[PDB]
Subunit: 290 residues, 4 copies
């Protein structure tokens, strides 16, 4: 459907984000479009602008949400807007990102070209994490990048067992474990030794965090696999579970973390000019044409 009510999500960061968020406000209101603003960012804006709503509310209000900032800002908007299946459009901070595509100086050219009816709809799946004490459920969180098990208030290594589709893989002693989507394969998992996974791929990568065992290597499994991490019951370690490094749960010795694909996919919007391997060449420095 054509985009009428357009929401805006931003991050309270350097001044340039507040600059582009008003060029976007100007360019969109110029086209006689209703602009609804996030309440968590409208408390510090030029005259606070127009109507104000919350992030869970912005799903059913808006037909499109433009996120200004970087890849990190895209993670928070995705977890809330994927449930409503709202198209999401990302703006850079001048540097090309794996989730943000529009440069602040090409704002009017690329955003207008999307509103005029030339764009690509790409869907990225999220992860569903849930902690359980025997049968009782502690908490359930979503993740677009990764679900990361890591030590909680103790530098000591943690111990756990990995299960994929109820099948025992191994027990391991390490700092933790990174479970990443293709979207998150370029983030923490890449810094921990994991591979790059193309966004077309229906797969999940499991990356050990500095394992005490040198032969512990990343595994890539079917994206429809169900992961089950069992914290060591015979150890006094209380690890932490992080979803996109922003939502944190504290696990008890013996707690079980289940990770699987979320049914609701995030509807990413790109210009037709989008090229995934060009993002890799700029974000990682790969050589260009010979």
């Amino acid at each position: 459907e054509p985009f009428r009510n357009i929401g805006i999500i931003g991050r309270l960061g350097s001044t340039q984000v507040l600059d582009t968020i008003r060029r976007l406000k100007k360019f969109l209101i110029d086209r006689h479009l209703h602009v609804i603003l996030e309440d968590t960012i409208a408390e510090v804006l030029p005259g606070h602008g127009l109507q104000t709503c919350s992030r869970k509310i912005m799903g059913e209000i808006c037909d499109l949400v433009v996120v200004v900032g970087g890849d990190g800002s895209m993670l928070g908007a995705a977890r809330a807007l994927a449930r409503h299946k709202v198209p999401v459009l990302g703006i850079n901070r001048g540097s090309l990102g794996f989730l943000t595509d529009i440069r602040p100086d090409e704002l009017e050219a690329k955003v207008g070209e999307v509103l005029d009816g030339q764009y690509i709809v790409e869907s990225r799946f999220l992860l569903d994490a849930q902690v359980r004490r025997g049968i009782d459920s502690m908490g359930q969180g979503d993740a677009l990048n990764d679900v990361v098990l890591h030590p909680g208030k103790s530098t000591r290594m943690i111990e756990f067992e990995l299960y994929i589709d109820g099948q025992f893989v191994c027990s391991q002693k390490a700092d933790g474990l990174i479970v990443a989507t293709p979207t998150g394969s370029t983030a923490y998992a890449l810094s921990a030794g994991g591979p790059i996974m193309h966004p077309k791929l229906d797969a999940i990568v499991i990356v050990p965090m500095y394992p005490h065992m040198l032969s512990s290597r990343p595994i890539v499994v079917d994206g429809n696999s169900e992961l089950k991490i069992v914290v060591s019951p015979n150890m006094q370690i209380y690890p932490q579970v992080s979803c996109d490094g922003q939502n944190h749960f504290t696990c008890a010795p013996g707690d079980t973390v289940t990770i699987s694909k979320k049914p609701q996919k995030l509807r990413l919007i790109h210009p037709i000019d989008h090229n995934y391997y060009e993002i890799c060449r700029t974000k990682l420095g790969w050589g260009s044409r010979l």
Copy 2:
């Protein structure tokens, strides 16, 4: 169909392979089954046994081929028996392998349990490699593990461009490139930093061989992607292409190597006792149950 004519493929290695190849000959002839032998191995056998045939011929003769040895012996049989779609059963040398499953001491117990009608049919796809000079074709080879570009008669680094589905990825200076299936993900690609890919996964992993660029990391793409490696035309390097490290082509500056999935899949046979993650725990040393 029930297995009647059963072929045998072996490797001219240590004495134990010649030992198990005759226990298999005894156990199979005991069950009143026709045993056909590979000609390349029957030239040195106890009285040369029964009928003798070639590997390309063994496809339409036999209903099942038992390969004794290790994972390396499985690679040669797969490239010839996947075209005929002949079931293949592997025997260990005492140590569990990613392709061979039967231990020489459990030969009669596991092979009989397969012939009695309790087995798993698992299909593994191969790679199709073809070198081209402009339009003319040099050679075309198959690979169950990997297609590897590596330096040819020169320790100097090679230069090349990578294309996936006609889309330019990057140019790179390295020793070479490893393109591996899920089967080959545990071989050379694992030693070069690549991840483990579950056999259920329809994916191909591209691993750079000691790249001059430190940010060159492995990529995992859709298994239906078509890869196109273009040797640097402006360099006096003549690289070599290896298929399972056994079939070698010499590439010219500017030659293009195309790699894609082969339509014919190898029909692997396993006992019901087969567990993939148990192979990883023994081949790599991962910790067992807590």
Copy 3:
């Protein structure tokens, strides 16, 4: 000097440590030697034994200290006994370690052979870490393995600058930094990608902890270099500094951590049967003789 007053240091762990600590008590008292016990371990012992002292006190009382347990138990004793320059002898838990050498079943044979006058004296140097706010000093700690900067109560990456001998190296965004001795090169630094450093080597290795930059590789510098880590002043991150993962300081944005070699070396005692590369072959699984 010949060893008369012999102290014992242990860890409150599995039952076998309490078993060997009494075979050592029997074997030493059998030889008419004064056995002094650590107070932190004598509170739970068979009748509490003989005299009891503290770890800082055990330096001037004893001529030799036998540490039962593993490599982790050796770290705590080293930081306190290196100031007094007391010889230290380590006992295994059945498995050969990089710091502990005696197997519990060869206790009487190897410990007696050392007391009879056949042993090797090997000295290992420690690290000296000190945090400073401008000029004021927060805390100063020693380390036999490593001084590790890591995130403090925030999964977000930390930012810092590295200085070696007052010379600027680089600024970096990562989980943290591992500064290890040759003793600690096989511990956390090895799991983070660092190299093995022979104990004869006067060198320090600096290993980045999952850096956001892929080209951030470990550096090995002169063991007499002075390291200076400056926490990012323009970031709201409060990192933590760990010495052997046991002593923890919380750093403020802008705090400077100085790391250099400690003058006092730890006097390690080994039997003449000691072989460093045999420890590597067992701890890491390297292949034995062809």
Copy 4:
């Protein structure tokens, strides 16, 4: 001693090397200095210039040798000019290198500042490699970067044993082994996973080339250690030994390669403006000042 007879060493590469080699010829003859040219490069020069000599002869003729090109050009000149202990000065191709320091546009400014008496003398040690069949010696070669054992005319893995100071380390199956100086630690060894070693460090790094064993990690040993690589006698593999990837020997099953530090050090000349960590920040992309 003040530099009078100044030799020039270049590489037959792109046109710019032939350009700078004549600005250097102009600037030096302008200062009334005798310029002697390498015969292997004077066959294609503007009128062939002045006197012509060989590389082994250029040691006793010249007081200083200026090498134009890159790090690779510095390797060949070092092996021949380190025996004569002739100071060596390197010129860049516009990009800063680990061995070349002068940019072609700062040629007259930096080279003149060295001739005027403001420079640093830094000495880098080389490696001494010698192959032996039992007692007979095949060949002996020097290396400024690395001595590399790698497969010879066979993609199959090679097998060998490592000995350090006559002490057995391990047996290993891999593509090969990289033995690098601090100078070569940033070259092949860095691409194979090795660490950066500061030039002040008296150490040698041993890096396995894609080992079949995942726990085979680089080792850093004393620079005065004597290495002894024994090719597997029970294998039909004929590996090759490369010194700076330019001098090649073919080893037989059972041949022993001995590697140790060469007594003659290469006298490198740098301007006072030289900074080693600035080279790392540009060659590897590390972050600059915060």
